[PDB]
């Protein structure tokens, strides 16, 4: 008589039908990549901030290096625990094509280190805001 | 679970291997005394097509070892949840 | 003849093989800790909100204390029923290293009071956003 | 169940001890007349 | 066994703890008022 | 006995009660339209920038066309990946009623190409800043 109680239970084991959503990890990946751009976007604005004043820009925080022809980026590299930012050259003198990495170190297996780096022009500033990811992954926003 | 976090997965239990890019499966292989589970590769890094055996060792003469193994895709995760049994026997649910 | 009907039933008792998932309670714990950060995160932004205006910040809600060099935090301490927030010093004048506790009072046995507190710098604002939890538990996001 | 909520667990039944950091086991020890159950420690705080 | 899956979900419903920021509408209001001055300020300068 | 375990599960399937928020896509649409104005708004200011100097304005970036009675708009048309800007006439000589399109190409199905274009007067400059969207969608800010 228990066989029928099990008939439902055989079913119950069966019915579950939306389990493995892997590329959940890959909209997660898009979140991690675009939101990896979120980490750096005011630092575009920061390189251009103090360079647009008359002042270079280091990576790190603090008061202004305001006797030093320098200012902070006002960032800790892993502000975003997906990974790390890296100013290049650091401090950004602006006449250099400054570069703002963002590595996706602390990331899923599907962005396990897919860097998103930015790079300005010295006279023209526009950050070459780019990614290492797949079209299914890209930071939508900046160029891929 | 843990691959979808950023963490690999071993077979066995315990606290998280949370300094280790690893987590338990949180299972003893013969959780089900019909037989045993086997993670493959173990620990599951996820970029591998992870496989979750279940052997039916401690089973009747009519399932005396008819394994039921699962295997995911690395990018697409869906467990190739399959069995060694006859149509009269099958695990109804996953594919046979 | 019933012995065989029981043979399945002996089995049926047996087969259940995923029961005690304890550290379910510990991803619950991670949820409770990170989502304990969710409770406070716009209050970072709030201490810095009115301090970044010219106005101090109390804990609690209400209209602005806008004749008072003060504003609310706009929070009830247990906005998150995992536990309670505590501004320190309250009202946050900003020139103090303001601190935003979050206690995990109303929490599981595995976060039964594991506080997550934040603390800014007066000149540099960045919340020392920290937790009392184990690596298996941590609020992923802020530092542990 | 209740440890996974935030609540300890006594042996016995009843409403939840839901102001008490406690819940029943929802069992009478000899639910099975083969003999008796015994929670230990009772109430189960789970950290035990 | 599903009860525990729900235990988190009961929590999940709970944890959201910064929802109703009304006087968001009132810094919005300050923005709308000061930035309502922004609309007119060169028209001071224009009358003059 | 399992039937009751399923009773909750039948419920659990049921209770989810805020799923299809479509016109989420339509505040997204408002965001995409107004924030489509954000893309162009300093280019109003740019057409008027160099025309208000004595210099025409091309679309694109670069140094000033400062031997050429010309300047850049200082924009790449899809600065905003919702779509593209288009100067018209390009280069903007100003005595023409200059026009600054913004197409919403890279947009949702509910703004899949709903352009937002601007057009100045030659003597009176004011950009006919307009949209193709529905009242539920409009770029709030400029006229619809």
């Amino acid at each position: 008589f228990t066989l029928i109680e099990l008939m439902i239970v055989v079913a119950i084991i069966g019915i579950l039908a939306a389990i493995a959503i892997p590329q959940y990890q890959n909209y997660v990946a898009r979140s991690e990549g675009a939101s990896a751009l979120a980490s750096v976007n005011p630092l575009k604005t920061t390189v251009e901030e103090a360079l647009s004043r008359g002042w270079s820009v280091k990576s790190g925080t603090g008061t202004e290096d305001a006797t030093k022809k320098e200012v902070p980026l006002g960032v800790a590299a892993d502000a975003n625990k997906l990974g790390t930012i890296a100013l290049k050259p650091d401090p950004a003198d602006g006449t250099a094509d400054i570069t703002l990495t963002f590595t996706m170190g602390g990331a899923g297996p599907k962005n396990k280190g897919k860097i998103i780096t930015l790079t300005r022009t010295a006279a023209d500033g526009l950050w070459k805001c780019t990614s290492d990811q797949d079209e299914q992954f890209i930071p939508k926003g900046c160029s891929r």
Side-chain angles (χ1 to χ4, degrees), chain A:
Chain A
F1 180 74
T2 306
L3 297 173
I4 190 163
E5 183 68 25
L6 293 178
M7 290 172 186
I8 196 162
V9 176
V10 173
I12 298 168
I13 297 166
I15 298 97
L16 295 175
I19 297 95
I21 300 170
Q23 61 183 353
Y24 183 81
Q25 292 183 2
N26 299 328
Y27 185 74
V28 175
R30 290 188 293 282
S31 296
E32 289 168 348
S35 75
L37 295 172
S39 68
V40 297
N41 287 316
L43 296 174
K44 297 189 279 182
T45 302
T46 304
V47 173
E48 294 295 329
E49 180 81 24
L51 296 171
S52 59
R53 295 182 63 199
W55 296 90
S56 66
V57 178
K58 65 181 176 181
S59 66
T61 64
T63 59
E64 289 196 345
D65 297 334
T67 61
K68 292 174 68 175
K69 299 296 186 290
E70 182 181 1
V71 172
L73 285 178
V75 66
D78 61 354
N80 180 352
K81 298 293 183 183
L82 295 174
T84 61
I85 298 167
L87 180 60
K88 293 185 288 185
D90 185 358
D93 60 357
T95 62
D97 293 335
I98 305 305
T99 296
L100 295 173
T101 301
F102 181 72
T103 302
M104 295 177 74
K110 300 292 183 181
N111 287 326
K112 183 64 71 176
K114 294 183 177 64
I115 298 167
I116 299 163
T117 298
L118 281 71
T119 301
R120 65 182 294 272
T121 300
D124 291 335
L126 295 172
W127 293 95
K128 299 294 183 180
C129 189
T130 61
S131 179
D132 297 338
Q133 294 181 355
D134 189 0
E135 189 64 22
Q136 59 171 1
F137 294 162
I138 301 304
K140 299 293 182 182
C142 293
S143 182
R144 63 181 294 163

